[PDB]
Chain length 273, copies 6
């Protein structure tokens, strides 16, 4: 027995936003809500009205889904996401993503706040994710497979679409800011990482560290939804600076990168219109 | 309260195969079913009739247990196994293995399809596993210990029996094919690994990567059942070639190694008769 | 809905030990019970009378909580702990630690039996833990946050208090035995580690390996309880010696370090009085 | 934590039937589907698309909700219901009824197939229920109360609305058939009643016996939805005739009363328009 | 595995009320809290601090346990109880009662608000319960038996102690008010009874009807705690008057009988001192 | 998902008793074990080896299934049964009965210890059950229906086979003892009934009262297994005598009727051979 939550969401959404077929699905992490404010003919639906959606329990996370246009592009946007640390397992973002797929989106644009594992890339930088290393226990698709959405086994080759990543490089140039590319390594949380765990992540080949992305992304590849992902660096991972880490410091430093993030997103949309 | 499933299986098996005490227990992974076809006085029992057994949900996996003689050796053979990715936890292959032990087997010969982490060893090769690194969440014996089968704590030293491994080296020589030995690293799945995860596995010391073996093997050591394990390399892990990965590609390339696998198994049996 | 077990324990404890405000909370691992015998005006309360406490299921572990004075310091002492391998998740030691906090302790002195990942440091040595790397699935605080004890997110910076660690260095000198400092890497168990997993732990930066510590420690930092931790090396991790590993050998070699452990603890208490 | 299923249904229904505020909600039992065929501008929504609705598992029961006009009255109609015997407890018909309430219905017109406990009233008769006696274990509102729909405690006085019952008496007259009024006694099922249980029901004051009605009705009174209920007598209860009971006999004899049932319903609608 | 909640409560209670061995345990239903106000040296412990106690969710019910002296008798008093309708099964009042037993009480004095099934006995009357008829599903002791408290099977003969009932008759005379004796019939609720159910209860031999008493009482007999019980008639059961039933009307009419109830309780205490 | 326990039992039983097709299945209640001692070529299988069987937890109940011949009739016999009061719901005897059906039995001969509701029939008497009245919550088949064994709905008409009951009357004559026929009313237990509940049972039409029979019997009718049932009267129900009730008194008085019970069973077998 499988979740029909995405199917119910399709119908619930037709009610608040009829004759609408979004092309891009966004997940706005901590602090990045401000972008949804600019969506054309914005219709907001609380997650409490959408079965399966991540009714927020996190600061920086709203619990709203905003549908409309942005750059004249039919877009759907999650203001707030669900994390493994909340206790509902690795499937927490799975119904939502499947909803994006059934809505007819062709890609997911995942954003998240994160720590840097490279001295070279500091707070304020934006990093395009080109791959990931999962450290959370298990994975989203563990369990009986839902044949309606994808196959039992599936490849993560080119999970972070190389083509949309090239477009992201172009937009960064055109606007005068660096857009490094890195390997994201997920961490369960909710505690931040130890300094030793961070050193282990460097050794293991990671460039960025966070508590999200992996569940959504693996879920997206399962149902054949292309993925894009960019992290807003809010600090240096633990042990890599003199700065004390907290959620308050994470919400605060996500503003140094905010304007660059908004322009990158809007420029990417212009190039795919 | 503990599982009595293996005890029930003993009795169920006496019905279909009386006065039979197998010495070797086989687990035939994806594609390797063909071997069970050559079993002497072959009696097939569907997993649906054996409490605790991995009623298949996977392509390449049958859901049959075949008992009989091979190279004149009383043998029991699993056509199909259970994996962590199916959602029933790390204990999925535990009752079955305990059944092998109560049947009186002295060793488990585990086979599995897998990806190579070494450029040197490509699709078509066979690798004898000499050890493993577990990446799946937790382990099979987590929980109350079943004193009827083994102790609370137990060693994995010489888990992949050095002696039976030497015999495997000799057989390979005697038949004209290389038999590299390697460290197996388990992965939860069902998604295949990312390229970065694969690089992390090289760094960590792994030679082979797959979604099985570890549960069965740790379960076997717990109840003092010696283990043997060989992987049929079906491809290069993610990022190590230009080849796209799928279950269809895994079932397909397990044939390049099939004849060598059959001869290795039959030659090993000959040497222990 | 949250656990009120620590609150119930406060009241249960007033009954057996009135007008008592302990400063240091101890967790005596396998073999180290002998220390609790010297507590002044020792009052023992079985874990069966304290909701949430780790009613033992492990050899070397009692299931007793001893309250009293040591070197004239109001102390509370756990004779036996709970482990992830028991099957009750990563929260197994969380209620107990919160009980220590509500009792008014200012620090946790965690002890545990462990294997060494350094040739240089053998069976009999004592190692002060300066940090850790978690390999167990998930973490203790995963799930809804209990605001009565701490915040949603929290730092592990200086988790193993640098100041109390300097005092430990001093005492060791004042008593004639090396007190190496190391990075502890947790392992789920109950099986011991494979040789390959051990090599992976060296590569990853670990110095000591065990099946406990991490749950208690992360729980302690969550509720702002300072931590101290020392491991009694009972052997070399797997593959690093010719010695066969078992719980019997772990209980046995924890005696070579016992007198040094007792003097270190008593000397540390003397310096904080 | 409470069910939001009715709220989701409101939104799902606006999609298939916009600007529609039904006044009467019908539950068509076994055999009575034929009535829904005459609904004006009939829109059918499968229960699989309505969270909480009784996805059928019973013969005679469809799993469809039909919305439209009948005798020019905005009506909503359940073709098929859920029963306690299905194993989902006494709350099985609760979300559906709450959906009727939020839709803005002012009354529920419950119909069901049933056995007679009075020799006087045989197969083919229709009986208006004036009250009930519950024999099923527990009740629908057992558990935390959902303040959004009604209060903790509530009265069943005039549960089967006396006023709408008087209208039913008039209609029956106006059409040439007797409409006896009776006390309905619920039974868990799925087995039919024993002869002794039936005698016990006579003694206890019952006139009609069945496996439904009570859950729906009590749920309706909780959220202040007026109720009407009529049973189509399909046989004499066990031990009261020579006739063998089965679901096939229940679906068959519900036709002797079908035309009278259709006219009663249509005449009642006419009088409330 | 059994509940140790009563054992924990013993210890928690010693903290708030040391060297105290109560003889009588009271359960004050809806409205009867006022009595607890006159307890000598009254110590109040919220149910949130007593594991297993009925943390209230009902109006008229506090969630406090008051210990002290009344008419100079060491007494323990529940201000508020738990009911089957709350959803935690028939065992809801079991730990509390066992706590009364371990505290050393020799009797339980259960009080409750209720409806009368006899015209003769109206709102304002007090009825001593001499026996009961259970209509709730199952019973409290269903499940594995806790040998520490009582036996597997046990008799309900003289459940409502004849001797303490004679004393109650005496006191009533000594105070000027009728004290009718009756058979109590439990009902699950939370809905009030139908008129037909009430007629069925008369037929079945009941005199009083309510939603409590039975769980507590059966639990008391199991652990050999004598019982007393008196109901404050707040109304006539459904269908027996013109009065509309609600919890507001139940809290209101429990005052007509309040002074008589207080004097009966205080006079009974006087006679057992 | 359904229970395959009966199918597993078939196979387990072939092992201990090959080429055996029993015609009659017995359930020996409390005290009646002695009969199984006389079974020809008796093979005993502990319930712990038969998935789904009532591993005993009750005095008077063994936990053994005995297969063999008796009166030269292929018979299967349960020494001990499962009851609703044990906490595993009304389905506790369902797998066992289905096992009897798959074994090929044509009838179930249910026996049980019980109390009499008729002054006329006292301790020592035997009563053939001709029907029943269920007072336990719900019924065995509640939940999804297992189509492999029977239909969703089914009749209890002639549940206690009139034909086998006539044979029972004949055998009683032929041996010189009365064999009254009565209506059995089930009670949940484990507490014995109150005197008032007993009076209610007389009023309701019952002749015998007990804590078993109903689950087994309804389960038997579901899978079309004919039923026979006889109760050994061990006492008068509560309030009908001066005798104190206990399980010890129930095991004791089941001997006054033992010889008559043995002869009745053996005579019935002779007449169906
Ligand atoms: N895990 C993790 N999440 C973050 N979010 C923002 N900064 C960080 C960080 O350093 N680590
Ligand atoms: N995890 C995993 N399993 C495999 N099975 C066959 N090839 C592979 C591979 O590359 N990875
Ligand atoms: N995990 C683990 N625990 C230990 N406890 C004592 N020695 C060891 C060891 O080598 N490994
Ligand atoms: N319970 C019950 N349901 C019915 N449905 C139709 N006839 C009957 C009957 O006699 N009893
Ligand atoms: N069940 C029930 N409880 C009550 N409490 C107060 N009055 C009543 C009544 O009439 N019925
Ligand atoms: N329920 C019940 N079971 C019994 N078993 C034996 N006697 C009795 C009795 O009186 N009542």
């Amino acid at each position: 027995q499988f979740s029909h939550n995405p199917l119910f969401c399709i119908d619930i959404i037709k009610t608040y936003k009829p004759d609408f077929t979004p092309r891009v699905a966004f997940i706005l992490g901590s602090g990045l809500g401000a972008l949804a404010d600019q969506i054309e003919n914005a219709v907001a639906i609380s997650y409490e009205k959408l079965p399966g959606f991540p009714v927020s329990t996190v600061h920086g996370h709203a619990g709203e889904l905003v549908l409309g246009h942005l750059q004249g592009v039919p877009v759907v946007c999650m203001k707030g996401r669900g994390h493994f640390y909340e206790g509902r397992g690795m499937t927490i973002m799975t119904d939502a993503i499947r909803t994006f797929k059934l809505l007819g989106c062709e890609l997911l644009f995942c954003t998240n706040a994160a720590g840097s594992l490279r001295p070279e890339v500091g707070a304020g930088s934006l990093v395009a994710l080109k791959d990931h290393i999962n450290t959370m226990p298990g994975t989203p698709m563990v369990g009986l497979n839902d044949d309606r959405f994808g196959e039992r086994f599936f490849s993560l080759a080119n999970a972070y679409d190389a083509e949309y990543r090239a477009l992201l490089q172009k937009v960064a140039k055109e606007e005068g800011f660096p857009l490094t590319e890195g390997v994201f390594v997920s961490y369960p949380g909710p505690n931040f990482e130890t300094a030793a765990e961070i050193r282990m992540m460097q050794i293991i080949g990671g460039d960025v560290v966070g508590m999200s992305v992996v569940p959504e992304v693996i879920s997206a590849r399962h149902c054949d939804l292309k993925v894009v992902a960019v992290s807003a660096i809010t600090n240096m991972a633990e042990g890599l600076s003199d700065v004390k880490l907290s959620h308050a410091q994470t919400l605060a430093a996500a503003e140094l990168s905010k304007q660059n993030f908004i322009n990158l997103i809007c420029g990417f949309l212009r190039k795919i219109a």
